[PDB]
Design a protein around this ligand. Structure first.
Ligand SMILES: *C(=O)c1cc(C)cc(C=O)c1OP(=O)(O)O
Length: 106
């Protein structure tokens, strides 16, 4: 049950996700998962980042879900659940702008 997850914001827009994440109190890695505005069945992982170049900014990654059961951002690294995916990206930055650190505050 993904909607039970505190990091799951469900049906919110891309603009809303960025409004929530662009708060100055948010450290790098602040994140949320929401439905994709356009892609049916896909989820979107929105993550805050920060650097002296760009300052505070937001990145979006598409989370695909296979009828065959797997969840993934890259087909090479798949998970049995969205929860396991989130747990894995909280420790490995891999190709993400930062590892997932803190759930986005409302
Ligand atoms: C998430 O589904 C998503 C992923 C990327 C790489 C980009 C964007 C847009 O900024 C996404 O949001 P979406 O609402 O699906 O367009």
């Amino acid at each position: 049950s993904i909607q039970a997850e505190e990091w799951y914001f469900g049906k919110i827009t891309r603009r809303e996700s960025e409004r929530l994440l662009l708060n100055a109190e948010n450290p790098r890695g602040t994140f949320l998962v929401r439905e994709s505005e356009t892609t049916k069945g896909a989820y979107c992982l929105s993550v805050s980042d920060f650097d002296n170049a760009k300052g505070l900014n937001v990145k979006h990654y598409k989370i695909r879900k296979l009828d065959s059961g797997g969840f993934y951002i890259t087909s090479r690294t798949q998970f049995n659940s969205l929860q396991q995916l989130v747990a894995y990206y909280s420790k490995h930055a891999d190709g993400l702008c930062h590892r997932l650190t803190t759930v986005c505050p409302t």
